[PDB]
Amino acid sequence: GIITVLLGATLALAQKDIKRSLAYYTMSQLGYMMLALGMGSYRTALFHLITHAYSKALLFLASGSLIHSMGTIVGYSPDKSQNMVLMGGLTKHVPITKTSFLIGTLSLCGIPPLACFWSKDEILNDSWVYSPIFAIIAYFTAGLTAFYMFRIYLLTFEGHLNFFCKNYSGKKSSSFYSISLWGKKELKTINQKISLLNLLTMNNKERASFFSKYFENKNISLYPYESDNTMLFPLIILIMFTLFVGFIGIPFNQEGMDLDILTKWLTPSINLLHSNSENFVDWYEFVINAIFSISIAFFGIFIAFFFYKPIYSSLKNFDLINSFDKRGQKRILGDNIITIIYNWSANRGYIDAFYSTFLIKGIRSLSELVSFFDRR
Amino acid sequence: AALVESLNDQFARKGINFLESSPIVELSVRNGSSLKLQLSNAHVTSYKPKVYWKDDGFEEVLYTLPLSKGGIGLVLNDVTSLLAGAEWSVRDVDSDSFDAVQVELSCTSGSLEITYVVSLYPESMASAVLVKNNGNKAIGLTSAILSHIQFKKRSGSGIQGLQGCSYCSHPPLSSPFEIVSPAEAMKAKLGEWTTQEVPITILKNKLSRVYTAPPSERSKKFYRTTPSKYETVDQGRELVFRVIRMGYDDILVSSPGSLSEKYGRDYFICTGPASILVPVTVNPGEEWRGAQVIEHDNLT
Amino acid sequence: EEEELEPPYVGFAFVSSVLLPDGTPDMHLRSATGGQKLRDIMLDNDIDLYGPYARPLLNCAGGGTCASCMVEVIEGKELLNPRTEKEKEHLKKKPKNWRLACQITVGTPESRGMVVIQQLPEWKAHEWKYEKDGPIVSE
């Protein structure tokens, strides 16, 4: 469970596909469930399963609706319609999907009072009771989870539409109108010369002096929009589930001795770590003992905000970015994380390729060898 | 007022209107972006593009003050002012299906024909100047299309895209539409030609710089050219406005610092393309062209 | 009769993917000493190379696995090393002039040629059509 937790957390840091990162940290949360089962926390593992299933369905359906929205402007190719690089600035276009994705992210970043916060910090406390090394790994994973989830959210909803951004995309320019910039004297499909571009229309720069040996398309304003209501209604229901399903493992309106719904449901339940403490937790007291998990999650969120929030956001200070000028593309930073993390995430942790190199091809050869012994 | 009626009978179209609030031309497009341009002088007093997807998502860009101050003002002075007392007259207007609009103003100065073309596109606005020489002697002139961009607060106002470009502390070119005098901007560290290393130019302090290649560097085959695009970032209302320079070879950037408290509550800067360090020569029969474009990606 | 005429350099002419509003393609000029990688030159001279992949963890940062290194080489292929194994792997079905900038060494520190590079060739609104070598035109 803890190995799966660390691998799934570290494999979703530098992904460009939204669904692949969703799968990888789904694997991470399942590893968390198995880690809780490893210490004998039956009720805690079932609580995390209940909360994570609803939050995961919410996030996956939101991502699918958003991919459906983007497919009208980038096409139906999943290499383009699931790329978070070309996906920024969708807050203005899909607001309901934005709220659903944000709620799922906050739930699975361990932020109160959402669903998975209670289950996750119960798991972390039980793991600290279990062993300190596992607790260290799990808390670092919680911070990493906050980082890559808000990385996904900022890459996918905040900023500008990178596919339709006029900084890069030359198709959505102002030169394709019949209105010419200079006046009523410009027309015709122009065919230029690199020499003219080199002299910069400042004739005096003619020193090369030799060699070394498209309109009519028409453009319209297209914007992504929210999907149909049949897609939106389960998103609303899953928003309600994500908001109000964490109260089945926590006591709802505790007044003295009160057992929650889940512990009354699982009245005979294995609990190896807390086999002697019949304690009743409190709704407004658990956020006091969960300062560490929320602090590490907020540290990861701060890192994600520094990395991926837009320049026009008030939370991003100009002086702090100036301190991160990194002039000279400092090689001490480039191969410390960025190259290593990107190669780890892109190569899928190098296990799968090994499974191709060692097992798959090998078994193929074995098959041929057996066929040879059956033929000659 | 009869001039306004004549202009309505001659040039009015879908998106082009003429009012008397001095005659002014109102340019409008399909999504609701609006632009006010005075006709007595080539002064753009208001640019309100649609940046939010609400029913009233039009946000004012230019900092405009009474008595014809601020905004976008074409300046054309000779060094070897040609717009003072000019009689600007509308030549013709053009339109692309209520999606884009355009208006041309014609003026004469000595033997020079000056055309100011102001156009609206659904996410951008363009201002171009074309001067044609008809005399028997070549001229040497300077020019600058200076725009006063309004920011919500002094902090959180910056410029992105001028990293690595050498900047010289130089006084802004004197214009009839100044908010701050060239002397009160501390004019310029005089000609230090420092190379900017930070990625964002912070405009909370009083600065007056020109971003361009040095005039000594411009005589070589390959040199670091003046950047063509640079964005103004406003964290007060989360707006990034991109400025594109063509024809000009300099970018004037000026900020007032504390002086912005005198003229109002909202901050402002004065930025735009310019040709100041190296005067531009025009032979007889030639033509010089320059243009400033303000776009925005806030709709996407 | 020459004092080397200048310290040795390689001139670079970068054509942006987005055209200017008047329709003329954007052009930038830089001068960088040879022997360095094209990625190490474009970022040092503040030239847009990755595009939307410029944010951290969105690019391989010299690892070669990422396809955001890709540029279009218009002129100066003599000064550049031929296609490597990683370029051949990542440039299937692509045109021959399309090259990964980070897997490129621009000659030697004693070079003098001119290299003309189109940045972000996938985002282009124009096209380059060679005509009997010599004249190179853009539509």
Automatic annotation (TrEMBL), chain B:
| UniProt GO molecular function | carbohydrate binding; glucose-6-phosphate 1-epimerase activity
Q: Name one GO cellular component term.
A: cytoplasm
- InterPro entries membership: Gal_mutarotase_sf_dom, GH-type_carb-bd
Listed under GO biological process in this entry are: carbohydrate metabolic process
Matching SUPFAM superfamilies: Galactose mutarotase-like (SSF74650)
For this entry, the protein name equals Photosynthetic NDH subunit of subcomplex B 2, chloroplastic
What organism is recorded for this protein?
Spinacia oleracea (Spinach)
Q: What gene name is given for the protein in this entry?
A: LOC110802223
Automatic annotation (TrEMBL), chain C:
Give residue ranges for domain 2Fe-2S ferredoxin-type.
59-106
The biological processes this protein is annotated with in GO are: electron transport chain; P450-containing electron transport chain
Per UniProt, which keywords does this protein have? 2Fe-2S, Iron, Iron-sulfur, Metal-binding
GO cellular component annotations, sorted alphabetically? chloroplast thylakoid membrane
Q: Does the keyword Protein transport apply?
A: no
**Which molecular function term from Gene Ontology is one that the record holds?**
metal ion binding
Which cysteines pair up through disulfides? They are: 60-66, 69-102
Key word Metal-binding present: yes
Q: What is this protein called?
A: Photosynthetic NDH subunit of subcomplex B 3, chloroplastic isoform X1
Origin species: Spinacia oleracea (Spinach)
Record lineage? Eukaryota, Viridiplantae, Streptophyta, Embryophyta, Tracheophyta
Placed within the complete protein, the shown segment runs 69 to 207 of 207
